[PDB]
Design a protein around this motif. Structure first.
Motif, PDB file in Angstrom:
ATOM      1  N   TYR A 158      42.316   1.882 -16.868  1.00 30.96           N
ATOM      2  CA  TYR A 158      43.463   1.231 -16.244  1.00 30.96           C
ATOM      3  C   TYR A 158      44.664   1.286 -17.188  1.00 30.96           C
ATOM      4  O   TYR A 158      45.666   1.937 -16.894  1.00 30.96           O
ATOM      5  N   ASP A 165      43.204 -10.161 -17.914  1.00 33.53           N
ATOM      6  CA  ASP A 165      43.189 -10.354 -16.464  1.00 33.53           C
ATOM      7  C   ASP A 165      43.395 -11.841 -16.236  1.00 33.53           C
ATOM      8  O   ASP A 165      42.516 -12.622 -16.554  1.00 33.53           O
ATOM      9  N   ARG A 166      44.557 -12.236 -15.712  1.00 34.00           N
ATOM     10  CA  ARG A 166      44.954 -13.649 -15.727  1.00 34.00           C
ATOM     11  C   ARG A 166      45.182 -14.192 -14.321  1.00 34.00           C
ATOM     12  O   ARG A 166      45.870 -13.567 -13.524  1.00 34.00           O
ATOM     13  N   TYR A 167      44.598 -15.353 -14.019  1.00 31.57           N
ATOM     14  CA  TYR A 167      44.776 -15.997 -12.711  1.00 31.57           C
ATOM     15  C   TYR A 167      45.468 -17.348 -12.848  1.00 31.57           C
ATOM     16  O   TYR A 167      45.155 -18.112 -13.759  1.00 31.57           O
ATOM     17  N   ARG A 200      35.795  -4.463 -15.899  1.00 32.49           N
ATOM     18  CA  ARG A 200      36.816  -5.082 -16.727  1.00 32.49           C
ATOM     19  C   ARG A 200      36.732  -4.617 -18.179  1.00 32.49           C
ATOM     20  O   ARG A 200      37.759  -4.439 -18.827  1.00 32.49           O
ATOM     21  N   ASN A 224      47.312   4.316 -17.011  1.00 29.95           N
ATOM     22  CA  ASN A 224      48.629   4.044 -16.466  1.00 29.95           C
ATOM     23  C   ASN A 224      49.723   4.307 -17.488  1.00 29.95           C
ATOM     24  O   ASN A 224      50.811   4.732 -17.127  1.00 29.95           O
ATOM     25  N   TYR A 225      49.417   4.082 -18.761  1.00 30.54           N
ATOM     26  CA  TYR A 225      50.374   4.383 -19.821  1.00 30.54           C
ATOM     27  C   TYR A 225      50.700   5.872 -19.765  1.00 30.54           C
ATOM     28  O   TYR A 225      51.860   6.265 -19.823  1.00 30.54           O
ATOM     29  N   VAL A 230      48.478 -13.634  -9.934  1.00 29.78           N
ATOM     30  CA  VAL A 230      47.547 -12.878 -10.752  1.00 29.78           C
ATOM     31  C   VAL A 230      48.370 -11.924 -11.600  1.00 29.78           C
ATOM     32  O   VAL A 230      49.298 -11.291 -11.100  1.00 29.78           O
ATOM     33  N   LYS A 231      48.061 -11.843 -12.887  1.00 28.24           N
ATOM     34  CA  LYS A 231      48.737 -10.864 -13.739  1.00 28.24           C
ATOM     35  C   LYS A 231      47.684 -10.086 -14.489  1.00 28.24           C
ATOM     36  O   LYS A 231      46.913 -10.653 -15.255  1.00 28.24           O
ATOM     37  N   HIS A 232      47.639  -8.785 -14.239  1.00 31.31           N
ATOM     38  CA  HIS A 232      46.705  -7.916 -14.933  1.00 31.31           C
ATOM     39  C   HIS A 232      47.539  -7.225 -16.002  1.00 31.31           C
ATOM     40  O   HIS A 232      48.393  -6.400 -15.676  1.00 31.31           O
ATOM     41  N   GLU A 233      47.318  -7.573 -17.271  1.00 27.67           N
ATOM     42  CA  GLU A 233      48.233  -7.168 -18.346  1.00 27.67           C
ATOM     43  C   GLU A 233      47.614  -6.148 -19.292  1.00 27.67           C
ATOM     44  O   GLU A 233      46.464  -6.278 -19.697  1.00 27.67           O
ATOM     45  N   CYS A 234      48.398  -5.139 -19.659  1.00 25.21           N
ATOM     46  CA  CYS A 234      47.962  -4.154 -20.638  1.00 25.21           C
ATOM     47  C   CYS A 234      48.918  -4.202 -21.807  1.00 25.21           C
ATOM     48  O   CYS A 234      50.116  -3.998 -21.629  1.00 25.21           O
ATOM     49  N   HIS A 235      48.393  -4.493 -22.993  1.00 19.01           N
ATOM     50  CA  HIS A 235      49.226  -4.610 -24.192  1.00 19.01           C
ATOM     51  C   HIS A 235      48.948  -3.438 -25.122  1.00 19.01           C
ATOM     52  O   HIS A 235      47.799  -3.171 -25.456  1.00 19.01           O
ATOM     53  N   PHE A 236      50.001  -2.731 -25.533  1.00 14.18           N
ATOM     54  CA  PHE A 236      49.829  -1.491 -26.289  1.00 14.18           C
ATOM     55  C   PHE A 236      50.408  -1.623 -27.688  1.00 14.18           C
ATOM     56  O   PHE A 236      51.504  -2.153 -27.864  1.00 14.18           O
TER      57      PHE A 236
END
Ligand SMILES: *[C@@H]1O[C@H](CO)[C@@H](O[C@@H]2O[C@H](CO)[C@@H](O)[C@H](O)[C@H]2NC(C)=O)[C@H](O)[C@H]1NC(C)=O
Ligand SMILES: *[C@@H]1O[C@H](CO)[C@@H](O)[C@H](O)[C@H]1NC(C)=O
Ligand SMILES: *[C@@H]1O[C@H](CO)[C@@H](O)[C@H](O)[C@H]1NC(C)=O
Lengths: 13, 180, 190
Positions: free
Chosen positions: C77, C27-29, C70, C81-82, C10-16
């Protein structure tokens, strides 16, 4: 300061 | 994009290994030691500025384990195909005789995330001062990993990083010795 | 050990983009390497990526509470977190150590390779150039490319193929976000 997790979701059985 | 932060998790059967980590632009911020239930910051300084409740990672990994059960069944028990690693050995800094340095063994582009890595000095296993990272995620969803060996360069010693992986027919040895 | 393996990721990704001005959450499975379902904040619902993910997309999309969690993730999230880590990640700057040394393309020959070793820097963006008596040399340049050391530092070797002549001064020039002006290191024959 606390890092927050994102939960993982139970899939369909 | 300027930056990417990823919370990456995996669970692997039948090994029953599960990992939880945060990545910033390809470097590890921290991972959770699942057995000790503790947050391990990649650089010690990180933990003076931020915290993470390790317990939350355990819950996610439990969900991932249950999801793996589900997905394995959905796929009609189709297993992973082994992808063997590429291995490189390099030093942290330019080498000077009897000036402390570090050998890096970079193990890249492989899956599943299970590997045996041994440092050899003059053909003999060495463990004094060694360290290693957890399995780190790649954008192609394979893995990479680093192993480290502090050493004092000399004309008398040769080194190898020996890597075992199920995708390899034989262990892979990558050599280093003092040049010229 | 020849037992078959099975992997879930699982990859929960935040792109800035432009600080936190624009943020995208994914949110990737994955089953092995195959992404099977994802939530994209650009969309606001889960979508199956392969047939394997169809049951989960439908089930998860039926959970309004989950979807609202989500949909808020870019704020609660990602942006959160940033803010927590930016001081030691986004703002991290470590300047390169630069060393120049001669080498040989073939053992029997005189020194005909100049190595500019650039070590210990962060972040990865760097520009390294070679100069011969103040003129940039763009030919005969080969590099390792950018190497991650795995410890929040990078290195790169940038080699110049050249036959040094007496009197010549070679210069390796390095530009990097940690620097306010180019860092230069000279090497003189002999
Ligand atoms: C890493 O090495 C270990 C040995 O310590 C391997 O584990 C054993 O593998 C053999 C070969 O199938 C089995 O008979 C044993 O039951 C395994 N366990 C032990 C405790 O010996 C392991 O397979 C190696 N991993 C890789 C990826 O090569
Ligand atoms: C598993 O087998 C069933 C029954 O034939 C089939 O409908 C399904 O498509 C298969 N799944 C995969 C991932 O091949
Ligand atoms: C980046 O964000 C600032 C506000 O912090 C804004 O003024 C600027 O226009 C943004 N850049 C672009 C290219 O839109």
């Amino acid at each position: 300061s606390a890092v927050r997790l994102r939960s993982s979701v139970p899939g369909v059985r | 994009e300027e930056h990417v932060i990823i919370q990456a998790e995996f669970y692997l059967n039948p090994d029953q290994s599960g990992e939880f980590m945060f990545d910033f632009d390809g470097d590890e911020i921290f991972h959770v030691d699942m057995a000790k239930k503790e947050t391990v910051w990649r650089l010690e300084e990180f933990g003076r500025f931020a915290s993470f409740e390790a317990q939350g990672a355990l819950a996610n990994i439990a969900v991932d384990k249950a999801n793996l059960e589900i997905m394995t069944k959905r796929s009609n028990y189709t297993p992973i195909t082994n992808v063997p690693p590429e291995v490189t050995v390099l030093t942290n800094s330019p080498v000077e005789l009897r000036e402390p340095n570090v050998l890096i063994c970079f193990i890249d582009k492989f899956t599943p995330p299970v590997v045996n890595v041994t440092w050899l000095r003059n053909g003999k296993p060495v463990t004094t001062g060694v360290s290693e990272t957890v399995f780190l995620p790649r954008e192609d969803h394979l893995f990479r990993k680093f192993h480290y060996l502090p050493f004092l360069p000399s004309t008398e010693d040769v080194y190898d990083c020996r890597v075992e992986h199920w995708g390899l027919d034989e262990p892979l040895l990558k050599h280093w010795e003092f040049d010229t | 050990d020849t037992r078959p393996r099975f992997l879930e990721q699982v990859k929960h990704e935040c792109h800035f983009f432009n600080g936190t001005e624009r943020v995208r959450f994914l949110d990737r499975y994955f089953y092995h390497q195959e992404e099977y379902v994802r939530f994209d904040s650009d969309v606001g619902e889960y979508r199956a990526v392969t047939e394997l993910g169809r049951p989960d997309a439908e089930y998860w999309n039926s959970q309004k509470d989950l979807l609202e969690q989500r949909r808020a993730a870019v704020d609660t999230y990602c942006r959160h977190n940033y803010g927590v880590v930016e001081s030691f990640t986004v703002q991290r700057r470590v300047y390169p150590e630069v060393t120049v040394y001669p080498a040989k393309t073939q053992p029997l020959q005189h020194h005909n390779l100049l190595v500019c070793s650039v070590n210990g820097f962060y972040p990865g963006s760097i520009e390294v150039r070679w100069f011969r008596n103040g003129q940039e040399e763009k030919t005969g340049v080969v590099s390792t490319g950018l190497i991650q050391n795995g410890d929040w530092t990078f290195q790169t070797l940038v080699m110049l193929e050249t036959v040094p002549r007496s009197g010549e001064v070679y210069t390796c020039q390095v530009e990097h976000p940690s620097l306010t002006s180019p860092l230069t290191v000279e090497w003189r024959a002999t």
